[PDB]
Design a protein around this ligand. Structure first.
Ligand SMILES: Nc1[nH]c(=O)nc2c1ncn2[C@H]1C[C@H](O)[C@@H](COP(=O)(O)OP(=O)(O)OP(=O)(O)O)O1
Ligand code: NA
Ligand code: NA
Length: 156
């Protein structure tokens, strides 16, 4: 089994809308995603999620709720991405566009799945139902899933 690197993903999910960030630069530009990044040495995963949310969007939160964990495998890449997925409780602030990310709220009847990572179509419905999940997705490139597993869990 490959080594895995820890990442976070934060979904700012309100009753009728979700905040996503559009990757502005680099390959993959134009995809909407939650906020997050690599966990750093010495921080808890949740603190890394809070930190990345703030660094990427400007938003702070007092607490995050862990809602899922998803492992991504990419053909041609040695490491798995172990993504710990959190949802926000009560955000502070306004989201800020950076050179790398444009934030945007989407109503929950307008979730832009076709412009999100393909896996999101599978697990974000569970998140919306207040279900917790574990997933794994193996991608060839950015668009093609070759294998995946997904399970609702009681405890992430
Ligand atoms: N298939 C996928 N589905 C998804 O919903 N989010 C994914 C994803 N693949 C990657 N991500 C998320 C996980 C994490 O939030 C982010 C990847 O982390 P990054 O490479 O952005 O980390 P960092 O911002 O720490 O790296 P640097 O910007 O180089 O420092 O993209
Ligand atoms: Na990031
Ligand atoms: Na980072």
């Amino acid at each position: 089994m490959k080594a895995s690197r820890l990442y976070t993903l934060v979904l700012v999910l309100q009753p009728q809308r979700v905040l996503l960030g559009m990757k502005k630069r680099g390959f993959g530009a134009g995809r909407w995603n939650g906020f997050g990044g690599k966990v750093q040495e010495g921080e808890t995963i949740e603190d890394g999620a809070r930190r990345e949310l703030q660094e990427e969007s400007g938003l702070t939160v007092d607490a995050l709720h862990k809602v899922g964990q998803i492992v991504f495998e990419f053909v041609g890449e040695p490491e798995l991405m172990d993504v710990h997925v959190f949802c926000t409780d009560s955000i502070q602030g306004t989201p800020v566009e950076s050179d790398e990310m444009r934030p945007c709220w989407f109503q929950l009847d307008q979730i832009p799945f076709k412009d999100m990572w393909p896996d999101n179509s599978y697990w974000f419905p569970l998140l919306l139902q207040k279900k917790k999940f574990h997933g794994y997705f193996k991608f060839q490139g950015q668009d093609t899933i070759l294998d995946y597993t997904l399970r609702e869990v009681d405890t992430v």
